[PDB]
Write a protein that binds this ligand. Structure first.
Ligand code: ZN
Lengths: 375, 268, 165, 85, 355, 95, 95
C-alpha cells in the first residue's frame, strides 16, 4: 500500500532554483518549455524545515572529525580520529573527508568512544568505526532518502571489512514542472553609490532572472518499505508521514527569498492510497492557456480533474479499490464541477486531512504519535 | 503623404545567449545607419538581390526621415517599437533580409495623410533634444588647473533650468516659447524621461601614405557623441494650419538624425 | 611535443557532460551540433597561442572523439602496435590471426579522414581484453606524421617486434 | 576602413577580418582578398570551414551561394551559444 | 515572531522604476501582464527618506579612500591609505577599489587612526584595517538588508586572516505587483494603477544582528513602517510629497510567513476605473478568510491590525471581524504595533538613534 | 550540488556535479507467437493463457526502475493496440 | 497466429535507461536523434513486476551453489557442489 500526494501550487514572481549561471531551471514536457524545481531542492526544503525539526535524526557531512571532537573534550584525539578515519577507507583533502558520510546523529557519541579508548589497536578501532558507521541508519531522515556509501579502495588498509551500507529508499519525489509555457524574464539592476563622485552612477551593473508559474508536485511514500526501514516501528512511521505531509504542505525553497519572498501556499491537494504508484502529470501535456472568464489555477484544477476521472474510469480494477481525499482551502476550488465527486471525503482544513490520513493508515491519533521522535 | 512605419525589435530574453537586437539598440549611430540602409535607389536593389555586397553610402537615397525608439503595452506584453516617419516608401524587405534575427515581427507601412485645421484640440507625444548654445562659453578648464586653455568655445551644451525650478515646467515654457512660430499651444505638458543618449562615429583619419599611391595606410579614429534628451507628451491646440504641416513633415529639434524630432499627433 | 601532452592532459581533465557531448558526435562533421564545435575550439585554440607547435585539427578531432568513446588512462610506453601484437600472439594461428591482422593492416592504407571506424574496431578489440592504458601522446604524434615512410615502417616494425619476442 | 566598418552578411559593425585566399600569407599580404566580418559571422564561417574540406582556399562572403547555411549557422549560434565559457 | 505587512496602494506608473531601455518594469502573474516595482527600489526608497534619516547608519561605498579625504588630518589620507586596502583585498583600478564595501559611517575615524600613524609597516596595518572593517556591524539598515563581502585573495599578501564578514538579512521584500492587468497606454499606428506590496521582518534576527538592542530595533521597525507608508518608490530624487497615502494596510504577527498575492490571480477588472481598489479590497478580504479556514492552526494563532484612511474601507467579512482593530491613523497603528511587539511606545524609542 | 550539513569557514559544498534527463513520448512494440509458446510450455494452454494475460497487464502497468527515486515518471500509456495476425508487423515507420 | 501489442506512452522528465557515463540512451532513427529504452530493460521490468509475480519461475544466476545449499540446508555440501559444477563445465572464479 502507498501514500500518494499530488499538489497544485501557484508562485508569485521569484527565482526558487538556479543553475551554475543564475538562470532558473527549465525542462521540456510535451514539446514546450516549462519552469522546473528540482526534486533534491524540494527534499532538502522538507528535511530542513520547521515542521520537520522534531524528526531530523540524520546528518550528511564531510567534517566527521569536527563532530567527533565536539562529542569529546580532549583536543588531541581529533588528530587520531582523522587517522582512524583514514585507514577505514575515506582519505583526506585539506583537513576533511574526500566524500560525504550519511549517518544517524544519535550514534555519533559511540563513535567518539571508539577514539576515547587507548587500549585498542588502529586496525581493530577502524573496524569498529566501520561497523558503527554502517549500522547507524535508524533515523527518519535516511528512511525515505536512503543511502549509498562507497569506501575508498585505493587508500583503505587491509583487514577492514565492510557490512551492508545501502538503505532502500521509501520516497519517490518527482520534479516539479509548471502546467503552462514558461515565461522567463530578465531584471536589470544597479548598485548605487552613497558618496558623490566626479562621474555618475558607478557601483555595479547586472541582469538577474526570474519567472512565475503554477506548478504540479508529486510525492510517493511506500508504506511497507518505510515501516521495514524503521525496524518495524509503526508509531514513528505514522509520525514521519504526518510531519512530511505538514512540511511539504507548508514550506518553500529558500532560493532568493530575501528579494522575491514567494511564500505562497498550495490550493489543491490529492492524497491517495493505491497498490501501484500512478502519475497525473499527463493532464498538462497540453499547456493550460488562460481565458477571460476563469483564471489559471481553476483551469489546471479542471484539467487535473478530467485526467483523474478518465484514469479512474479507464484503468479500473475490482479486487483493489482506491480511496482518495481532496483538499482545497475552505472548498475554494472543488475537484471539478462537471464530473462526480472523485473523493471519499472533501476536506476544507489541513489538520482534518492529516487526521484522516493517519486514520486510513493505521487509525493513529495525532498527539499519540507526537511523542515518538528521533531528535 | 507620410509613411508611418513601425518596427517590432526582437530584444533578448536570456543574458547568456547572443542578443544582437539589444546590442544594436545600445548605439544610436548604428540604429541610424540601419534605418538609412532601407533606401536603395536603383543600383543596390537590382544588381544584388541578396545584399551580399560591401557597403557604399553613396548608393542610397538621401531621403530625410524621423524615427523614435520607445516601448508600448498593447494587450498582454511589452514591445520595443521604432516608429519611423518618412516621405519615401521604406524598403524593409531589403533591410533585414539577412539580419532577420533583429526583428520579432514583419514591419508595417500604413499611409498617414492628415487634413487638420486650426482650433481643434489634439494630443501628442514627442522626444526632443534639450541643447542650447551659450553666447558666453566657459573656457576649456584644463583639469590640472581648471582655469582655462583657450577662452571661447561656442558649444551646444545643455539646457539648464535655474536651481529650484521644476524641470517639467521649464521644458514646457521652453517649448511654448517656440510654439507660436510652429503654431501650437500647450496647457498640460509633462516630462516623462530626461536623460542622455550616446553614440560613436568612425570619422576616418590618415596616418601614413602608400609607397605607390594615396594615403591608404589610413585607419579609423572614433568620435563619441552625447545628446541630452527629453520625452514629453500632452495636448496641443492647432493654430495657423499651414505651418503645422511643415512642422509635422520636418520635426522639432536639432538632432533629427539621432532620434529626436518626430512628433506623433492623434485626434482628441 | 609538449602541445600534444597539454592536449591529452586537458582531455583527461574533462568532465562527463562534455564527454557525453563528444560521445554523441561520433562519425560526424564539425559544422553541426554547435556545443561540440565550441568545446573543441575551447580545447584546441589555447595550444596554438602559447606553444608554437600544435596537433593538426583533424588529428585532434579524431583523438578527442576516440578518447570520448574509448576512455583510456594515458600511460607512457603503451603504444598501439605493441598492445596489438601482444593480443595477436595469444590467438589461434590459423583462422583468427589472419582476420585480426588484416583488420590491423587495413589501417596503414588510408588518410586521417577515414581512420575512425578502422581505429574503433581496434579499440573495441582492446576493450574486449580489458585494457586499462593507451599511449595517446605517441599515437597522436605518429598520426600527425602519417605520410612519412619511416613512420609507417617503425609502426609495422614495432608491431612485428612485439609479436615475435 | 574600406568596407566602412560594417559586416558583409548581417551588416553589423565589424569586429575582425576573415582571411580568404590564404595563399601569400605573412609577406605578400594584399588588402583585397581579406573581408571584414563581425564575431558571429566569422565564427559561423570558421564553423563551415572546420567542417567539410579545408585547403588553401577559403569560404568567401558576397558569394550568392553558402548564404542559407551561413544564416542557419547564425540561428544556431544565437540560440545555442552560452556566454559562460 | 515575524511581522508581515500586506498593503495595497495606488501609484502612477511610467515614472517609478525602469530598465536599461527606459521601459517600466513589468512581469507576468497568473498568465496575465502586470506592472512591477522592484524590491531593491523599495528597499532603497525607505533608506533615503525623511523618516529613515533619524538612523541612516552605514554606507555602501566604492571609493573608501576618498571617504578618508573628508576626514583627514593634512594629506596622509591618500595613496598610502589607498594601497593599504589595495594590497589587502581591493585592487584600485584607478582609485575605484573595484568593489562595493558596506560599512558603518561612524567607523571611518578609527580607520583613519589606523592609517594616520607611521609605526606600522606592510600587511600589519592591512590586518588592522581588515579586522575593524569586519567588526563594523552595528547599523540599523545593515541589519535589515545584510551584507556579503568576499575580498580578493589573489593580491592579498597573506596574514590578513578575516573573521566571518557576513550579515544575515532580517528583512524580506517581495516585488510589488498590480492587482489588475497592466494599463494599456495610447499607441500610435494619466491613469493610476493599484499595487500590492508585501514585507516581512524577523524580530529575532533583527535583534540578534544588533546585539540585543530591542529599543533600536523597535525604532527601526516604526521608522521602516512610516517610510514605506508615506514615500514614493523611485530614484527620481524629486516629488517627495506623500500625495497618495496607503489605502489598505494589514499587519500580521505570524511565525510562518505567508504571501496573499494569490488573491489577485484573477485580474480585478472594472470598467468604472473609480472603485477598483475597493473591489480589490474585497478580493483580498475573501482570500484571507479562506486562509484562516484553509490553514487554521490552534496552537499558533495569529493577530493582526487593519487600517484604511478615515475607516472608509472595512477589511473583514462585511460584518464578521478578521483583524482585531479598525485603526484609522498611521501613528496609532505604529503605536499598536510597538506595544504588541514589546510593550513600547513611539515616544520612548525615538531617543535611541544611530544618527 | 551536495550541501554540507556542518557549518565551516568557507560555506562551500560537499560535491558539485551534473545529471542528464529527458521527457519523451515513446512507441513500444511486443510480439508473441502463440503456437511456439504452446510448444515451449509442453502442450499446456491454461498456463499459456495466464502468461498472455499477465504479460498484457504487466506491460501495460509497469515502468523501469532507473532513477525513479529522483524523477518518478510512473505514467500509464494513453493508447494500446492489440492485433491478431499471421505475420509480425511493426508500425514504427509512422514516426 | 501472432498476438502483437503497440503502445504509445508519454513520460515526464526522467532518466529511465542509462549507459556507462550516465547519459540517457539515445539512437538515430530517420536521420534524427531519439530517446531509447532498451528492450532488455523493458523485458526485465515486465519479468520482475507485480503482475508477473505469480509466474516468475526461472532464475538466471551465477550463484547456483548457494541456491543448492539453501535448498539443501547443510554446510559441507556447498564446496562439494562447486566441485560438481567444475565437472559439468562451469569453472568457478572468486566464490
Ligand atoms: Zn555579421
Amino acid at each position: 500500500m502507498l501514500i500518494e500526494i499530488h499538489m497544485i501550487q501557484n508562485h508569485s514572481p521569484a527565482n526558487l532554483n538556479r543553475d551554475d549561471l543564475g538562470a532558473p531551471k527549465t525542462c521540456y514536457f510535451g514539446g514546450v518549455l516549462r519552469s522546473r524545481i528540482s526534486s533534491q531542492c524540494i527534499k532538502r526544503s522538507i528535511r530542513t524545515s520547521n515542521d520537520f525539526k522534531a524528526l531530523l535524526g540524520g546528518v550528511r557531512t564531510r567534517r566527521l572529525a569536527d563532530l567527533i571532537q565536539q562529542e569529546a573534550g580532549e583536543t588531541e584525539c581529533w588528530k587520531k580520529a582523522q587517522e582512524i578515519l583514514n585507514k577505514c577507507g575515506f582519505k583526506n583533502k585539506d583537513d576533511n573527508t574526500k566524500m560525504l558520510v550519511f549517518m544517524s546523529k544519535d550514534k555519533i557519541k559511540d563513535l567518539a568512544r571508539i577514539v576515547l579508548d587507548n587500549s585498542l589497536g588502529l586496525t581493530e578501532a577502524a573496524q569498529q568505526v566501520a561497523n558503527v558507521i554502517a549500522q547507524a541508519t535508524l533515523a527518519p531522515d535516511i528512511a525515505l532518502c536512503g543511502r549509498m556509501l562507497e569506501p575508498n579502495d585505493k587508500d583503505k588498509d587491509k583487514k577492514v571489512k565492510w557490512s551492508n551500507t545501502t538503505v532502500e529508499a521509501a520516497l519517490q519525489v518527482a520534479h516539479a514542472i509548471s502546467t503552462h509555457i514558461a515565461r522567463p524574464e530578465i531584471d536589470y539592476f544597479v548598485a548605487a553609490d552613497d558618496v558623490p563622485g566626479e562621474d555618475a552612477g558607478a557601483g555595479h551593473i547586472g541582469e538577474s532572472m526570474f519567472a512565475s508559474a503554477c506548478f504540479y508536485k508529486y510525492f510517493s511514500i511506500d508504506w511497507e518499505q518505510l515501516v521495514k526501514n524503521l525496524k518495524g516501528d509503526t508509531n514513528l512511521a505514522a509520525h514521519t508521514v504526518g510531519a512530511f505531509l505538514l512540511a511539504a504542505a507548508k514550506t518553500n525553497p529558500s532560493g532568493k527569498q530575501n528579494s522575491f519572498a514567494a511564500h505562497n501556499y498550495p490550493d489543491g491537494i490529492l492524497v491517495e492510497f493505491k497498490n501501484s504508484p500512478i502519475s497525473y502529470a499527463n493532464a498538462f501535456v497540453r499547456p493550460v492557456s488562460v481565458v477571460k472568464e476563469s483564471d489559471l489555477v481553476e483551469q489546471s484544477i479542471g484539467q487535473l480533474s478530467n485526467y483523474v476521472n478518465d484514469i479512474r474510469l479507464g484503468y479500473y480494477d475490482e479486487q483493489s479499490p482506491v480511496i482518495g481525499f481532496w483538499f482545497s482551502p475552505n472548498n475554494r476550488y472543488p475537484l471539478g464541477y462537471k464530473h462526480s465527486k472523485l473523493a471519499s471525503r472533501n476536506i476544507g482544513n489541513l489538520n482534518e486531512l492529516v487526521g484522516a490520513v493517519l486514520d486510513y493508515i493505521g487509525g493513529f491519533k495525532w498527539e499519540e504519535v507526537q511523542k515518538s521522535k528521533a531528535y | 503623404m507620410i509613411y508611418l512605419s513601425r518596427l517590432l525589435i526582437d530584444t533578448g530574453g536570456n543574458p547568456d545567449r547572443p542578443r544582437p537586437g539589444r546590442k544594436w539598440l545600445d548605439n544610436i549611430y548604428n540604429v541610424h545607419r540601419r534605418l538609412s540602409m532601407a533606401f536603395p535607389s536603383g543600383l543596390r536593389r537590382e544588381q544584388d538581390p541578396h545584399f551580399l555586397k560591401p557597403f557604399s553610402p553613396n548608393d542610397f537615397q538621401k531621403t530625410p526621415f524621423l524615427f523614435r525608439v520607445d516601448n508600448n503595452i498593447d494587450g498582454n506584453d511589452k514591445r520595443a517599437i521604432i516608429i519611423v516617419q518618412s516621405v519615401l516608401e521604406p524598403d524593409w524587405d531589403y533591410c533585414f533580409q539577412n539580419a532577420l534575427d533583429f526583428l520579432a515581427a514583419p514591419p508595417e507601412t500604413k499611409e498617414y495623410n492628415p487634413e487638420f485645421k486650426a482650433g481643434q484640440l489634439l494630443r501628442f507625444r514627442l522626444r526632443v533634444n534639450a541643447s542650447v548654445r551659450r553666447h558666453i562659453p566657459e573656457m576649456v578648464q584644463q583639469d590640472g588647473q581648471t582655469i582655462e586653455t583657450g577662452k571661447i568655445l561656442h558649444k551646444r551644451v545643455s539646457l539648464t533650468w535655474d536651481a529650484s525650478s521644476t524641470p517639467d515646467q521649464a521644458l514646457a515654457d521652453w517649448l511654448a516659447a517656440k510654439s507660436p512660430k510652429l503654431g501650437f499651444t500647450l496647457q498640460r505638458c509633462e516630462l516623462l524621461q530626461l536623460g542622455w543618449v550616446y553614440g560613436s562615429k568612425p570619422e576616418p583619419k590618415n596616418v601614413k601614405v602608400k609607397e605607390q599611391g594615396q594615403g591608404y595606410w589610413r585607419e579609423h579614429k572614433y568620435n563619441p557623441l552625447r545628446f541630452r534628451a527629453a520625452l514629453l507628451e500632452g495636448v496641443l491646440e492647432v493654430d495657423d494650419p499651414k505651418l503645422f504641416l511643415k512642422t509635422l513633415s520636418s520635426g522639432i529639434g536639432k538632432a533629427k538624425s539621432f532620434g529626436f524630432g518626430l512628433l506623433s499627433v492623434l485626434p482628441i | 611535443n609538449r602541445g600534444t601532452v597539454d592536449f591529452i592532459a586537458s582531455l583527461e581533465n574533462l568532465k562527463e557532460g562534455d564527454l557525453g557531448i563528444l560521445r554523441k558526435l561520433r562519425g560526424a562533421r564539425l559544422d553541426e551540433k554547435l556545443p561540440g564545435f565550441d568545446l573543441f575550439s575551447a580545447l584546441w585554440w589555447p595550444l596554438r597561442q602559447k606553444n608554437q607547435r600544435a596537433p593538426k585539427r583533424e588529428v585532434a578531432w579524431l583523438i578527442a572523439k576516440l578518447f570520448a568513446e574509448f576512455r583510456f588512462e594515458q600511460r607512457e610506453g603503451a603504444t598501439l602496435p605493441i598492445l596489438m601484437g601482444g593480443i595477436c600472439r595469444k590467438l589461434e594461428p590459423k583462422k583468427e590471426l589472419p582476420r585480426v591482422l588484416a583488420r590491423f593492416d587495413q589501417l596503414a592504407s588510408l588518410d586521417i579522414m577515414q581512420m575512425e571506424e578502422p581505429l574503433s574496431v581496434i579499440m573495441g578489440i582492446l576493450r574486449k581484453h580489458q585494457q586499462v592504458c593507451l599511449d595517446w601522446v605517441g599515437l597522436t604524434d605518429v598520426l600527425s606524421f602519417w605520410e612519412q615512410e619511416p613512420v609507417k615502417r617503425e609502426w609495422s616494425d614495432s608491431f612485428i617486434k612485439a609479436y615475435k619476442i | 576602413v574600406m568596407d566602412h566598418a560594417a559586416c558583409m552578411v548581417c551588416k553589423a559593425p565589424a569586429t575582425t577580418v576573415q582571411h580568404v585566399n590564404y595563399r601569400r600569407a605573412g609577406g605578400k599580404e594584399i588588402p583585397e582578398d581579406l573581408r571584414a566580418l563581425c564575431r558571429l559571422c566569422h565564427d559561423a564561417c570558421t564553423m563551415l570551414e572546420y567542417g567539410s574540406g579545408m585547403t588553401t582556399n577559403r569560404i568567401d562572403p558576397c558569394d550568392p551561394i553558402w548564404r542559407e547555411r551561413i544564416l542557419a549557422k547564425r540561428k544556431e549560434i544565437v540560440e545555442f551559444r552560452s556566454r559562460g565559457q
